[PDB]
Design a protein around this ligand. Structure first.
Ligand SMILES: [Zn+2]
Lengths: 158, 158, 341, 48, 345
């Protein structure tokens, strides 16, 4: 591939200089490097709670109190998740429910004053950021700016 | 509005359960306007702070990460956690669940070292560098010879 | 208090706006008319002002009516908006210095220097002998001697005259390594405060805990100096601990407080225990004070924006409009008679 | 009409809550005799 | 921790490691960006593929894997197979057109590189449009979008450098943003400058009167068609809304919303109204001849408010005939058994 991303052997990037036949080949390989809810969403789906349940069971009763104690607190959450109710991939947000409208009114006050549930200024926060994101992805994407936004976005969702 | 639609194609109770052909409005009073919900579709996910920042990070607990600090680290800012695999080394094997910095991560994806030292005058270092630059593999510490000492202290080619 | 606005250098300055005489006299409307119509009975005030220049010329723009200030009815009540209103008096810790028993440790009590306005340090002297003494302005403590040294009090003269009868003197002469360098102690304390500031600033911060702002302009004579001579220490040279004549400061208050601490802790110079609730400790704010304060807060707001226009006005004709804007004083004073709790 | 007052419908306090609660990830669904749905929001929540 | 500092450090660090030299580096990248275009176009030319597609496939290979195509843009380009097919044809392009392929990528790259390097430029600019009603980070980001806009139009043939060019394209982006998102209720750019002018005017008017101008001065000083009604209106829209949720009364625990009443909702009084009204109106409606009563009942009470267009086949003469004779027999017996007289309204 041309001169950005190409994995040949253990070395993984390939620049091209058509001057002399020169295939510059840089050496670092497919390194899944992620940050943000993106990365945790992945980790969260991959886990088979059953395994960690059994693994902690052993960790719980066998080693000394230091690492087994941590494991008993860590088995609590894993148990309920599995026990009865719903599964853990949901703690990650990708679809934000919006509170009803008349609950976040827009009203005529006096002369023309208007009152709105503060929730609406936050909502706009999220939407603008979310959109600006999409447009920043499409426009073209310089890394610093994409994350920068994704940070803002995150905060907003909070 | 009460039982009426927005444009008004249908306006009373006889057809209370149907929606308007050209525009969408099924009606009972504006209470439906205060109980219904909409959702925003987030670009790249973000997480619920209700689960991330409660004392026991329910995702930190479940996902064996730094329960309180590894999260904050990758979540809001750019500190990457190698998710599935990453063959190349830091000095040791791929860190299955460990997190790294921009700096070192940078050193990974493009190549070990970035050194752009560009010479002061037109004849002194332009010659030292040129003679040894194009096809000559330059070893670490290659002592270019003119402005001060142009020091190339790293790997393979130039 | 806020009229001599000294603005010197950052570009061009040397500004000197000076106050001459305050005069207010012709009420806009009358009492009853102010109640029939929704009106705020306030007297008009415009004092004389003359701004100087570093170049030949001093333009005096006589009047500027900023701030319409309410007046009192002969009975004592006001007329702010339609309804007659009243300013209720208040109560608090009178700006002085007292010594109160320590929090949790039954041991010994600690000193407190109270300086109102809010902006203006709040000091406390506490000794915890395993190796530390604590004097706190904003928060973090430092030695009680590093300061005396700065001013000029040396280990020998201090310890011997103040605490010969007070063995506590030994905690004062303790860190001798630092006590052997005078004016360097000034820079070193500056270091102790914490921003990452320029070591060099000749006599700037020492000024602040010196003469003008933080300490107070309450009448030179009986405002604070009353709480002094009778309670502790004898003299005051300059209202509060103040001086800026030679660069070398004088502090007739910093030593007496410790003096009384070593005294209060060692026997009966007198019986130095202050019952806070004693009324000679709690002062009553009469109407005047309550209004004069909001009046000066406004003056500051005014003086704030005027400074900005000492740089905005092109050449010398900047006396009237260039320096004064009545928006602050109005909102300020108006807010106090209509919105004050 | 001199009819004995009707038997209370769900209070708005309740509904406002559930939705406030829905405003946050959480899902609050009422249930039946046998753990099955039941409906507080009379007919305004089903879609379209 | 706290957001501003992290991003500032974030791009300031990278610029710190890679600022673009004044001429060389900007020229270099620029040259590469343009050749990319010229390339992508000639690529479209020999592939028959839309320049939009050639642009997204080279983007994917240089900026990101299947991951970046699948989440951002839902799913029309098959994550693997699709984009790859396209890449294959690009390879088939012999020595001559293959060159354009290799160029497009590197250009795309430079684009990104030129974009990184000039991020301090944005921040420095965006730094001054701070207190307009937008978050600094938001402002820098919009401005950033502005720089990306400049990258698409800069012609390196015309010697002027990217500095002066980016300034404009960014300042435009920011000001727009300020006018588009700053308020809760959207106000077009014209209204905005309008309001700025109004404001600036009121300032010059505050200068000497000692009287916060009546809306007379403002009209005059503003210009051609300015009147009292216009200024009172403009400043009415200028006021941002209030927080339906603000600390109220004595600031203890007062939320501005329990005090506003509600209008649509029929206070009990009205529910009782509609009951008797509809039961009694319904009784009358039945005891009458359907022909012209329903016509006027339905034409008036069922759809919208047309004598002629009101009756089916029977013309106006029978309409007015029965309308006015049934309406009066109905009102005069209702006069007898007084049920309706007590005006339900
Ligand atoms: Zn319709």
């Amino acid at each position: 591939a041309d001169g950005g991303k190409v994995k040949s052997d253990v070395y993984g990037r390939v620049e091209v200089d058509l001057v002399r036949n020169v295939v510059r080949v840089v050496e670092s390989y497919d390194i899944d490097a992620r940050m943000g809810a993106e990365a945790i969403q992945q980790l969260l789906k991959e886990l088979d709670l059953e395994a960690l349940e059994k693994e902690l069971l052993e960790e719980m009763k066998h080693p000394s109190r230091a690492r087994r104690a941590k494991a008993r607190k860590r088995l609590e959450v894993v148990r309920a998740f599995l026990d009865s109710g719903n599964r853990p991939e949901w703690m990650i947000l990708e679809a934000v429910p919006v509170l009803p409208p008349d609950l976040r009114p827009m009203v005529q006050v006096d002369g023309g004053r208007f009152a709105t549930s503060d929730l609406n200024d936050l909502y706009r926060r999220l939407i603008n950021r979310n959109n600006r994101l999409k447009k920043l992805l499409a426009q073209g994407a310089p890394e610093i700016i994409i994350r920068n936004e994704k940070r803002m976005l995150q905060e907003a969702v909070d | 509005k009460d039982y009426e639609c927005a444009c008004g194609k249908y306006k009373r109770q006889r057809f209370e359960g149907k929606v308007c052909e050209r525009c969408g409005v099924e009606v009972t009073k504006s209470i439906v306007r205060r109980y219904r919900m909409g959702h925003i579709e987030l670009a790249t996910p973000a997480a619920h702070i209700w689960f991330v920042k409660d004392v026991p990070s329910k995702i930190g607990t479940l996902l064996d990460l730094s329960a309180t600090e590894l999260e904050q680290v990758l979540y809001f800012s750019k500190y990457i956690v190698l998710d599935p695999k990453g063959a190349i080394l830091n000095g040791v094997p791929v860190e299955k669940r460990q997190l790294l910095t921009d700096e070192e991560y940078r050193e990974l994806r493009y190549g070990k070292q970035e050194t752009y030292p560009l010479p002061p005058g037109v004849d002194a270092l332009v010659k030292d560098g040129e003679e040894v630059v194009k096809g000559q593999e330059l070893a670490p510490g290659v002592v270019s010879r003119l402005d001060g000492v142009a020091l190339y202290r790293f790997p393979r080619r130039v | 208090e806020t009229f001599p606005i000294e603005e010197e250098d950052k570009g061009k300055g040397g500004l000197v706006l000076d106050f001459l005489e305050y005069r207010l006299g012709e009420p806009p409307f009358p009492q009853d008319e102010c109640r029939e119509k929704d009106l705020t009975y306030q007297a008009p005030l415009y004092a004389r002002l003359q701004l100087i220049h570093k170049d030949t010329g001093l333009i005096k723009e006589d009047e500027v009516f900023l701030g319409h200030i309410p007046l009192m009815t002969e009975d004592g009540s006001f007329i702010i908006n339609g309804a007659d209103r009243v300013i209720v008096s208040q109560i608090h810790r009178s700006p002085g210095v007292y010594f109160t028993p320590d929090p949790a440790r039954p041991g010994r009590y600690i000193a407190s220097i109270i300086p109102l306005p809010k902006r203006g340090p709040w000091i406390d002297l506490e000794v915890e002998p395993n190796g530390v003494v604590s004097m706190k302005v904003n928060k973090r403590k430092f030695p009680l001697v590093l300061l005396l040294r700065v001013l000029g009090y040396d280990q020998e003269t201090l310890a011997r005259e103040l605490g010969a009868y007070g063995e506590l003197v030994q905690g004062l002469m303790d860190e001798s390594v630092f006590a052997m360098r005078p004016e360097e102690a000034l820079i070193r304390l500056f270091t102790l405060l914490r921003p990452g500031d320029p070591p060099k600033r000749d006599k700037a911060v020492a000024y602040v805990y010196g003469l003008i702002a933080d300490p107070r302009r309450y009448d030179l004579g009986e405002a604070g100096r009353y709480k002094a001579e009778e309670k502790l220490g004898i003299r005051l040279s300059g209202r509060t601990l103040a001086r800026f004549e030679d660069g070398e400061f004088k502090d007739e208050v910093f030593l007496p407080t410790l003096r009384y601490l070593f005294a209060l802790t060692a026997g009966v110079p007198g019986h130095e225990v202050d019952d806070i609730d004693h009324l000679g400790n709690r002062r009553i704010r009469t109407v005047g004070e309550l209004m004069t304060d909001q009046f000066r807060v406004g003056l500051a707001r005014l003086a704030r924006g005027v400074r900005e226009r000492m740089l905005m006005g092109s050449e010398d004709s900047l006396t009237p409009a260039k320096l004064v804007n009545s928006r602050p004083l109005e909102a300020a004073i108006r807010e106090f008679f209509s919105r004050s709790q | 009409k001199g009819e004995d007052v009707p038997e209370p419908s769900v209070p708005e306090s309740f509904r406002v809550l559930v939705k406030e609660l829905q405003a946050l990830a959480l899902d609050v669904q009422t249930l039946d005799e046998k753990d099955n749905p039941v409906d507080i929001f009379e007919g305004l929540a089903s879609k379209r | 921790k706290i957001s501003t500092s992290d991003p500032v450090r974030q791009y300031l660090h990278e610029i710190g490691q890679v600022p673009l030299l004044t001429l060389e580096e900007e020229v270099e990248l620029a040259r590469k960006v343009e050749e990319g275009m010229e390339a992508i176009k000639k690529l479209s030319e020999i592939t028959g593929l839309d320049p939009d597609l050639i642009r997204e496939v080279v983007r994917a290979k240089i900026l990101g894997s299947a991951r970046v195509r699948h989440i951002p843009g839902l799913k029309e380009t098959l994550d693997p197979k699709t984009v790859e097919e396209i890449d294959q044809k690009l390879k088939s392009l012999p020595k001559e057109h293959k060159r354009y392929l290799h160029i497009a990528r590197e250009g795309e790259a430079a684009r990104q590189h030129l974009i990184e390097a000039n991020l301090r430029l944005v921040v420095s600019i965006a730094k001054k449009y701070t207190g307009r009603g937008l978050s600094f980070l938001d402002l820098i980001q919009e401005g950033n979008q502005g720089l990306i806009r400049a990258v698409e139009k800069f012609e390196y043939k015309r010697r002027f450098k990217f500095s002066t060019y980016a300034t404009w394209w960014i300042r435009q982006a920011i000001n727009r943003a300020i006018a588009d998102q700053a308020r809760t209720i959207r106000i077009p750019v014209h209204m905005v400058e309008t309001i700025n002018k109004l404001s600036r005017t009121a300032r010059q008017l505050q200068q000497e009167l000692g009287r916060e101008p009546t809306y007379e001065e403002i009209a005059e000083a503003m210009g051609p068609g300015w009147d009292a009604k216009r200024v009172e209106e403009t400043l009415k829209i200028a006021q941002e809304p209030v927080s339906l949720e603000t600390p109220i009364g004595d600031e203890k625990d007062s939320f501005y919303g329990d005090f506003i009443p509600d209008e649509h909702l029929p206070s009990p009084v009205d529910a009782a109204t509609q009951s008797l009204l509809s039961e009694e109106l319904e009784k009358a409606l039945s005891k009458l001849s359907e022909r012209e009563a329903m016509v006027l009942k339905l034409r008036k009470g069922l759809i919208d408010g047309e004598e002629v267009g009101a009756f089916f086949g029977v013309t106006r003469e029978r309409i007015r005939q029965i309308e006015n004779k049934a309406l009066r027999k109905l009102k005069y017996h209702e006069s007898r058994t007084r049920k309706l007289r007590d005006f339900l309204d």
